[PDB]
Design a protein around this nucleic acid. Sequence first.
RNA 1: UAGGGGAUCGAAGAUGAUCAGAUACCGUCGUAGUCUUAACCAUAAACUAUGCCGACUAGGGAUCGGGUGGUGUUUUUUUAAUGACCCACUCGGCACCUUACGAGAAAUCAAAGUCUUUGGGUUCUGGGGGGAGUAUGGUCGCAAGGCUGAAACUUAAAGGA
Lengths: 142, 150, 129, 142, 81
Amino acid sequence: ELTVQSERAFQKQPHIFNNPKVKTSKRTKRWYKNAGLGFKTPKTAIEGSYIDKKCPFTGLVSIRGKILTGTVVSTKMHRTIVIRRAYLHYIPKYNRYEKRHKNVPVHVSPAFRVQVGDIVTVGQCRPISKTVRFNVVKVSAA
Amino acid sequence: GRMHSAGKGISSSAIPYSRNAPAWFKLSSESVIEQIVKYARKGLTPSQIGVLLRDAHGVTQARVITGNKIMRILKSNGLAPEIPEDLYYLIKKAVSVRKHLERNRKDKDAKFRLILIESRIHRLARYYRTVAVLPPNWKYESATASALVN
Amino acid sequence: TRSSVLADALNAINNAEKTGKRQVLIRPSSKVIIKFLQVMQKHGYIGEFEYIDDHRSGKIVVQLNGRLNKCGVISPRFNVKIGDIEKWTANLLPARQFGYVILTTSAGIMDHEEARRKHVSGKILGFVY
Amino acid sequence: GKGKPRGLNSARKLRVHRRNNRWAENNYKKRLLGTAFKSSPFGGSSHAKGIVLEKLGIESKQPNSAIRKCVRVQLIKNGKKVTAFVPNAGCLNFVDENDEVLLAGFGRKGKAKGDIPGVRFKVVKVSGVSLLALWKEKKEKP
Amino acid sequence: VLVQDLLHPTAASEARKHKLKTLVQGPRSYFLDVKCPGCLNITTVFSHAQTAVTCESCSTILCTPTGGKAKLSEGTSFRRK
RNA sequence: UAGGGGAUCGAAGAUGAUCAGAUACCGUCGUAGUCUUAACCAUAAACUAUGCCGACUAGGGAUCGGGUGGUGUUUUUUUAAUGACCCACUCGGCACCUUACGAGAAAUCAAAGUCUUUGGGUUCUGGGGGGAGUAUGGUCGCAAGGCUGAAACUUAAAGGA
């Protein structure tokens, strides 16, 4: 990767123009944005060459509704990952909780370089796959 | 009550209360630093250092006399040893036992005791995982101990 | 181990007092406990009690009256909501009057009748009578 | 420190170690296999229709002698072949062979009553008109 | 006994009771400033050796280690401290 | 199961005794096994036939392990030193006596106590007697066998003190 065309199919962030007739300086564009909801829009976003539509910041996916975390469990997917949310639950009878967990499928951009272990905030997109819904938004390494 | 048998032993030291000085001792703090760092290359182990320090010179513990705890000091000076010392006697015991199991496969007592011991180690090796003092992954490997020391 | 502290000392205090020891010694000192007694005392159930330090987790003498009837530690430390204590008193207090159930909030390592005048509740460690 | 886990997170291990226990207690045995539908005559019931065969004679169990009155039946269902028991008099007479009879329990569950052995039912009606009457003479039979 | 100050008891009852219960714990072992006869030197030895230490350099011997307390040689003033 | 060991006991097997019979009791020999290495099996009256955590009630006198104090008992060596010892105290045992305020069907029980004044925490189990821990399936084992576990039928008692 890193090399950008790689996906035969060429790539661009749609509606972008540059102007081989007209003085060109800077040659390239970009389009970026700022999620929002108290975030910080990092600088490997307005710098990073890569494409990815499913990018929060460099593309056409909104973020609305959950805000949530947790602990990464596995990463082995070409731009996507997995989270746990070890949680607690209060049985009304023995008056006591249990350690329960659900795993979570989520997209992710090259702007972040997550290994396993890291604490991680995420959003909640329209739907983005078969399972898949949230989009990482902020990593929390060592 | 010792973690492996039917045995409820009691016996340590009744560090004495005084934090500061012995007073009756009047030599310097720098003085013993020098002394330990003197000792180390020679061929030390922090455990022993104190013993030797105690039995001969002023000291009472490094601890009073300085604001550190031997090791800390060797570590500043770079003499810590690649291993956390208490470990480097356990692994040792491994080699020294396993070897004995293999002159006399017709010995159970010994066998068990070996395991027991493989385990002291894994647990103590899980801790000197956790806290940044064994490069992660370290795992102990039965057979790799004889060019790790001789 | 010693897996829990408050407990251990408390039990010995309902096993001093039964026999008529006028007092106690108890080992591992906490804040928790210092606070615990300071509640008990205000309410007329022990006196004085003469921390002792030894630079360690430390020892505490508790001079007697011969009043104490009984002060078990509860002990997960459950949770509790305000209007719920109204279930406890009558499942572990002889009366009502009296004799304090006792709990841990935020202020407060402080009983329930004072709790009304504060209107607060969290977790419920021991209880006296 | 009695034999059970007690602290806070000891929901998980409780909702199991009652759900195991319950087993043995006989009742919760009937209600999970529940027996009631497969085994036994009425299955998941209370009453039923049957039609008589012979008029069998069953003597006594013994602290007793007592030669009582029983009838085999054919139900109008599993078909079992059952016996059953008659009250009052001779009562026998009023159950004239291959007639329609209405059977019910014996208030004991399963089990087996008083001085009778493998016997577990009573004859309530005949033809459907009482027995109770076709012995206090409030009706008669076709 | 229905009662007693366990704060301060007798001095008795401590001397005998075990190091780790006199309330505040404190050691029994203690140190012992030794003139071998030849030299004036003065080495600071410990009551429970574990080591025999040599005296200063004279190469002399001193005090053997046993169960608990050294057995010190003949010459030695062994003033305590 | 396969090697080593194979003194003594000693099912099995043989015996002589006793006896109406005696394939048993009694006696003398006796493979196998008892013993060990390495591997299986997982049952027992595996027994306090009493789940563990805890917290609280009523007296004692012993003992093992610690610890504290007593110008405490000897040790004598010069005084100490320790050490054994005595006693005082305690914490942790392994039990025991005595009461019964309580509990119980009782016998008995400092726990089987704090339970119709019914509720501190939670895991297993049983619901008449047999049929039968069998028949079946399912499974662990090389096998012996284990764990799982019916029903039809029969019966007014079987049982505890």
